[PDB]
Design a protein around this ligand. Structure first.
Ligand SMILES: *[C@@H]1O[C@H](CO)[C@@H](O)[C@H](O)[C@H]1NC(C)=O
Ligand SMILES: *[C@@H]1O[C@H](CO)[C@@H](O)[C@H](O)[C@H]1NC(C)=O
Ligand SMILES: *[C@@H]1O[C@H](CO)[C@@H](O)[C@H](O)[C@H]1NC(C)=O
Ligand SMILES: *[C@@H]1O[C@H](CO)[C@@H](O)[C@H](O)[C@H]1NC(C)=O
Ligand SMILES: *[C@@H]1O[C@H](CO)[C@@H](O)[C@H](O)[C@H]1NC(C)=O
Ligand SMILES: *[C@@H]1O[C@H](CO)[C@@H](O)[C@H](O)[C@H]1NC(C)=O
Lengths: 266, 49
């Protein structure tokens, strides 16, 4: 149930460089052997992103509620089923709307349905069956519920040293709500590697919420307020900004590389 | 095609057309391809005249 799992040793501030990452597909149009300039909310190249570590090597349940601004770049390059979903709400206490996203590796339960979130909502599999399901208290008013499950968007099944490089982009411009996602196999240790990656608007859901603030739901392992494990998390937050990008399309219709026309005079 | 009104000849094409992409365009921002809503086949559009 909803427990006051504190385990709060405040991690020191962590900042890293996003490099040439966080760029998605602007539109659903096939372009070949051309360069296209688009003005949209992108992640600035070589910008500063926040790297929360929800590890237990240093028991830290890093679940802070951070603002949304214009969109969120989330590089959850973690191990098997650590971070599951995300809560997007101005207050997320059943006073106003608070859209919840949960995948649980089996379904998709995107629901506006303003819930009474008690302190820190989080998931967890008991020492195995998923047990921690009381992320809130009541559904209050349940608006558009999207009871359809496309598939498990986490796409787990790889192991190594943060091998599953998973990236998501959440956007809420006027109406609608876009979730872009790309997965890439890399080794490194924890940081965002070099290269270029972008693949499709994974899931588009028309909601129209205020989405002022946001947080993430963290799965755990029941053996409870302290007897758990964290594995190795890679909580990554980047705030999008309105920039102009010159994307390049090869002859087989995939974006190879892009530049940000605000970084340096070159 | 889903409101994409136009005049021309539809011909089976070799365009890759990744699943999310639906329209396809050339340098002049003119749709020279389409995805058929019934059958997911790519038909490029070559204008007549
Ligand atoms: C974040 O990185 C930028 C350069 O990308 C740097 O100017 C800035 O001081 C950094 N911020 C922090 C808090 O380290
Ligand atoms: C999707 O799977 C989860 C597995 O925990 C289950 O709790 C949930 O009820 C399922 N959704 C539906 C609509 O059956
Ligand atoms: C809940 O939604 C219903 C249906 O639209 C609406 O009439 C009602 O005012 C809302 N609020 C409460 C507190 O029931
Ligand atoms: C709701 O959205 C408006 C318009 O984007 C925003 O400026 C405002 O801060 C939000 N309202 C509250 C009460 O947070
Ligand atoms: C060319 O298209 C083919 C389709 O079979 C694809 O396998 C290949 O990756 C494409 N080339 C590039 C460079 O993406
Ligand atoms: C739509 O229905 C037609 C038959 O009326 C069928 O040939 C076609 O495959 C269907 N399209 C889809 C996307 O299921």
């Amino acid at each position: 149930q909803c427990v006051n799992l504190t385990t709060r040793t405040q991690l020191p501030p962590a900042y890293t460089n996003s490099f040439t990452r966080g760029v998605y597909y602007p539109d659903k149009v096939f372009r070949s052997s051309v360069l296209h300039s688009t003005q949209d909310l992108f992640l600035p190249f070589f910008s500063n992103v926040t790297w929360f570590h929800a590890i237990h090597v240093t028991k830290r349940f890093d679940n802070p509620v951070l603002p949304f601004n214009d969109g969120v770049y989330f590089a959850s390059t973690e191990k098997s089923n650590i971070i599951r979903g995300w809560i997007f709400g101005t207050t997320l206490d059943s006073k106003t709307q608070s859209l919840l996203i949960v995948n649980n590796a089996t379904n998709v339960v995107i629901k506006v349905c303003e819930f009474q979130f008690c302190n820190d909502p989080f998931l967890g599999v008991y020492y195995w069956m998923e047990s921690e399901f009381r992320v809130y208290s009541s559904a209050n008013n349940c608006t558009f519920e999207y009871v359809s499950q496309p598939f498990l968007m986490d796409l787990e099944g790889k192991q190594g040293n943060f091998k599953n490089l998973r990236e998501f982009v959440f956007k809420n411009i006027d109406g609608y709500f876009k979730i872009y996602s790309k997965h890439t196999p890399i080794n490194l240790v924890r940081d965002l590697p070099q290269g270029f990656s972008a693949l499709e608007p994974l899931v588009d859901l028309p909601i129209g919420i205020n989405i002022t603030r946001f947080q993430t739901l963290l799965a755990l392992h029941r053996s409870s307020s302290s007897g758990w494990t964290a594995g190795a998390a890679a909580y990554y937050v980047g705030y999008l900004q309105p920039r102009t990008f010159l994307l390049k399309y090869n002859e087989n219709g995939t974006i190879t590389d892009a530049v940000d026309c605000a970084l340096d005079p070159l | 095609f889903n409101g994409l009104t136009g005049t021309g000849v539809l011909t089976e094409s070799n365009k890759k057309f990744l699943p999310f992409q639906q329209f396809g365009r050339d340098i002049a921002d003119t749709t020279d391809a389409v995805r058929d809503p019934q059958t997911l086949e790519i038909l490029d559009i070559t204008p007549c005249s």
